Design a protein around this ligand. Sequence first.
Ligand SMILES: N[C@@H](Cc1c[nH]c[nH+]1)C(=O)O
Ligand SMILES: N[C@@H](Cc1c[nH]c[nH+]1)C(=O)O
Ligand SMILES: O=c1ccc(Br)c[nH]1
Ligand SMILES: O=c1ccc(Br)c[nH]1
Lengths: 408, 408
Amino acid sequence: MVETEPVQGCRDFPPEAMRCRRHLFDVFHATAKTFGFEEYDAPVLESEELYIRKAGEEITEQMFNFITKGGHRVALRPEMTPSLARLLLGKGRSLLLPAKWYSIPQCWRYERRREHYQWNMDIVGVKSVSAEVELVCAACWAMRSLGLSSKDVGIKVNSRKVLQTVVEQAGTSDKFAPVCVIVDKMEREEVEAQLAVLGLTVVDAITTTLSLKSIDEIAQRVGEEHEAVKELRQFFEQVEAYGYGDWVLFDASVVRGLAYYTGIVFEGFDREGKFRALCGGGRYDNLLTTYGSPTPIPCAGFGFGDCVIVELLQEKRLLPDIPHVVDDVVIPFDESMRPHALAVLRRLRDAGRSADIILDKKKVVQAFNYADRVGAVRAVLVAPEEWERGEVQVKMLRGFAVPLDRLV
Amino acid sequence: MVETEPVQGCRDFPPEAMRCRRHLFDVFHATAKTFGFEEYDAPVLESEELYIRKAGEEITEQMFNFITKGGHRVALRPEMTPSLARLLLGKGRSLLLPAKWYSIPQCWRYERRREHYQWNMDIVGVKSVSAEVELVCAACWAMRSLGLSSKDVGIKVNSRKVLQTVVEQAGTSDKFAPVCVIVDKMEREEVEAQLAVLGLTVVDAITTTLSLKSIDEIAQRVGEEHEAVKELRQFFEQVEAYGYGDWVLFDASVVRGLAYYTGIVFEGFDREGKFRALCGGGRYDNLLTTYGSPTPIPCAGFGFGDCVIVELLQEKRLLPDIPHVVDDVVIPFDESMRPHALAVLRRLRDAGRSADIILDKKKVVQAFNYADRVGAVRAVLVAPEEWERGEVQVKMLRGFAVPLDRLV
Ligand SMILES: N[C@@H](Cc1c[nH]c[nH+]1)C(=O)O
Ligand SMILES: N[C@@H](Cc1c[nH]c[nH+]1)C(=O)O
Ligand SMILES: O=c1ccc(Br)c[nH]1
Ligand SMILES: O=c1ccc(Br)c[nH]1
């Protein structure tokens, strides 16, 4: 008896479960198409070097990685963005900008679930916050398309520049990424200890700025035209104008856990406070300069997982079981009628219908139950008497005789 | 400067290439839907035990496998069928039969390409050759849907039972799988040496039966009602009746390289003799008994790779570059018109159109070139004068003024 359960931390997707995933992925695809994003992909197996960002990120700490027989250090990707950057760096000048690219990669971790799918959406070559607006609107669009309202969820929005100014005014730029990574852990005294463990108080000014409840209060401390203030107002104006003002809001505690975000950062959340972040993203204008690009390339994007959204949708009763369906089930009255049943099967499919034929040998009434079981819209019985007349019997399920030509 | 090339033996799919893959996958999905198959998935990471079939299979020799930090023996799947069987064994009595399941998994190997996508289609719980008929017709259907004709390709069909009878008449059942695996390598004297290396001449009778050019010649040696003869005639009758008689033919040399096939086996091929097999499959009625099932479960299916088909389609000029398209590109006359452009963007998308908005700051004529570049069907300019009139300018690309309501 072989082991029927999957490998540790991984999910099986039999048809029932697969219909749920496909319901979600259809939306991710549909939303990307609606927003003009182009699909891409890359190996799930990338070199380990790609994720050595030396900043204590949880994503790179929990990296599912190994050595090949040939000695190479690789990993099942913990995220897509580095892969995207590699592709972009590879294209160089040939890449026409701006580019809007998406994918729904499976991503991995070691030490609970070890895999998830993550819709990625990234805009490349756009300096202005219109990028972040579009991205944030796409995330809302997908949630709305799944039946969620602005009463169910929102997106918290912030800029890392505010904090950058504080870290800059408090004496070096190099430590900013480790700082963001610790500060991200705030949601206690342990995080204060980590900031001390990093070195240097500036800790106090960080806590207060994370607690500032509005942009005007940021403007009090930054002036009405810090980059961050101008950007956020621009951001909120555009999202308001697009018609999703009830979906977004400011929150100064939002930094995200990733090292490479340089500007606007954001996070999807359920308004009942029950679930982890639904999606997360931001601007990362220096990543490609880090990977070696001679010219700086502005980038922004987000990742949107397949689990939290599903738990949420289940809680809201927005994931009813989707039963399998099929247009026609062709029933041979008996085995002598099979070749004729097959010709009819061909006609049905030729015309763009989805059809089965009873493959095994069974009595008509069993075949009808089977048809009902697989969610057939109508059953097409192919019997001798009707066949002579150039006909079949058709019964709608959601037995009048019909010519072959009139079936489709 | 980071490494821009992907990991060894793996493919990047930037948008250009991804459109090609998606063109192929659309057909695999569309064909599965047409034939009533239900989608499923399972981890790419499976336990290594799943593929220890001890029969010298090339698929299990070339297994991309490793040990976890926790000591477990796993592998990136070299094929899907064992995963499918695991799922089936797991369901047991709950699984309603017959079941028709499909997937388009990425599968792996170590020692040339180390990964490929493989459309799988499997029918479970059907004793009769109607299963193999359906499967073979689906494979033809996909190739026809890609623009190929029966003049371009075919499917060679055979039964392993004929040979089984010869191995049985020549003295044990246990050695049959290793024998098939060697005999599969025939397409010289090295294969004769491998049959001797296995033991035991019966070798001679094997060579002659592989060379028998028709079923009547099989019937000469098996009788008109060997299981295999009755099955193949049944098979060919049904495929003829379905209307794909020009696509299929008998070939006694076809065994396939996999251990678990017990009955009908088949192989897609280009009629110019230029390419390796396009797809391959057959009946495997004992696999689930091997994995521990208390009741025998009849199964048949095939795998259909993503590379050979593409080379073939490229040779036949059936893979023209598919350019990106989008319905609308919204052009703000300048930055003061952005909020209005955004409201229009919202209307367009609300109505099920795919639309971009010029995200960056640029002059109208650049925005029009950009629109043409991304394959926009029409450009929607949002200027002050027209906005006052409740209007925008619309230009078809494959500048009349229009009311907002009349856009969609
Ligand atoms: N890679 C980020 C999301 C993201 C995509 N693009 C930019 N950010 C994450 O895994 O959370
Ligand atoms: N797993 C087989 C194809 C197949 C699917 N189902 C049955 N056979 C292969 O890789 O060639
Ligand atoms: O980076 C990640 C995060 C969560 C999971 Br599950 C896999 N990989
Ligand atoms: O089993 C296989 C066969 C070919 C390739 Br590429 C990967 N895996």
